[PDB]
Design a protein around this ligand. Structure first.
Ligand SMILES: [Mg+2]
Ligand SMILES: [Mg+2]
Ligand code: NA
Ligand code: NA
Ligand code: NA
Ligand code: NA
Ligand code: NA
Ligand code: NA
Ligand code: NA
Ligand code: NA
Ligand code: NA
Ligand code: NA
Ligand code: NA
Lengths: 190, 190
């Protein structure tokens, strides 16, 4: 039926069991549970879920701080908040840390399953886009630093740009360091 | 008092009015309204809203097709669906086309304002990511096509890489063309 790996985070045990029953009847896999933010971070690090269902308010460590950590280290693909609190200050924190949904307790159960589906898909889309950005940024910066190092090597040695690139390559091969690290060493403080 | 520009799309005038009253009381600007998918596409193209609230079940053209069009041509920053139906086929289509929220009628009003805040924030974030990807890709492709053109000129002319680049520069400036446009002509599926 519905596919996804879910972690449930709430300090009230019966509320966790009610949510658990709902998502298991939908066919999601509940890969872990937690009662405070420290447990939430721990469980998400181990399980690496598609989604965290979390109350913003919990003992010891609140859900917003736990969520900030979970997004920051990408321990789950998406976070959806479930809380009795819905003031603008709490929702501004939840949206700025990165949450994909926020339903207010008592839960409208019919909305929960659609919200989970949307949040899982959007979270994995976002992870893909951030990976694209990382790769593209790396390739562009490596081209830039290699170009700058080539210019420096030409000016210092009086070689051609082709010979400078072959210097960077042969150094990279023989050392077993990337040409961008070689180039950074050539460029430093210039 | 919230901030955001919203289009409300529902075939029922009373439901449009109920939602309008809620979001206006919250402080959002309703920039347009529609009763079918063709109207919704047109309104979004004129208004370019931060969010469109859309029913799936509509005559003439349904919400999923209109939403797919709105995402494809970036006519709104986010879509949230509002349907009496919550089945897996409708939710699969909504998530794949790229919706950020799906909520199920009759509306749990207390969730609506939080879901709007999340969806607007996530939509603006995603547009930033997509913009960064396009900028990085264009810069990288310009570098790549110039590199390819330089190597072609070197091999045909038997000039140095430096002289090849100055050829591309001189052509670009004399023709008042982008150097990538010149390089595209030099490469011409070589
Ligand atoms: Mg609590
Ligand atoms: Mg309808
Ligand atoms: Na289970
Ligand atoms: Na993750
Ligand atoms: Na904040
Ligand atoms: Na997304
Ligand atoms: Na990421
Ligand atoms: Na150079
Ligand atoms: Na409704
Ligand atoms: Na953002
Ligand atoms: Na592009
Ligand atoms: Na050059
Ligand atoms: Na340009």
């Amino acid at each position: 039926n519905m596919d996804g790996r879910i972690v449930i985070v709430d300090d009230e045990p019966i509320t966790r069991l009610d949510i658990r029953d709902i998502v298991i009847e939908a066919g999601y896999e509940v890969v872990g549970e937690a009662a405070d933010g420290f447990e939430a971070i721990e469980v998400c690090k181990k399980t690496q879920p598609d989604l965290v269902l979390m109350d913003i308010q919990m003992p010891i460590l609140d859900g917003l701080k736990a969520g900030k950590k979970i997004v920051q280290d990408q321990l789950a693909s998406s976070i959806v908040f479930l809380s009795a609190y819905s003031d603008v200050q709490n929702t501004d924190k939840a949206k700025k840390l990165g949450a994909l949904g926020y339903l207010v307790k008592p839960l409208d159960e019919k909305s929960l399953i659609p919200t989970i589906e949307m949040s899982i898909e959007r979270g994995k889309q976002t992870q893909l886009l951030l990976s694209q950005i990382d790769k593209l940024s790396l390739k562009l910066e490596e081209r830039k630093i290699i170009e700058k190092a080539k210019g420096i090597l030409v000016k210092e040695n009086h070689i051609s740009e082709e010979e400078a690139y072959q210097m960077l390559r042969t150094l990279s091969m023989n050392k077993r360091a990337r040409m961008s690290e070689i180039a950074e060493l050539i460029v430093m403080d210039d």
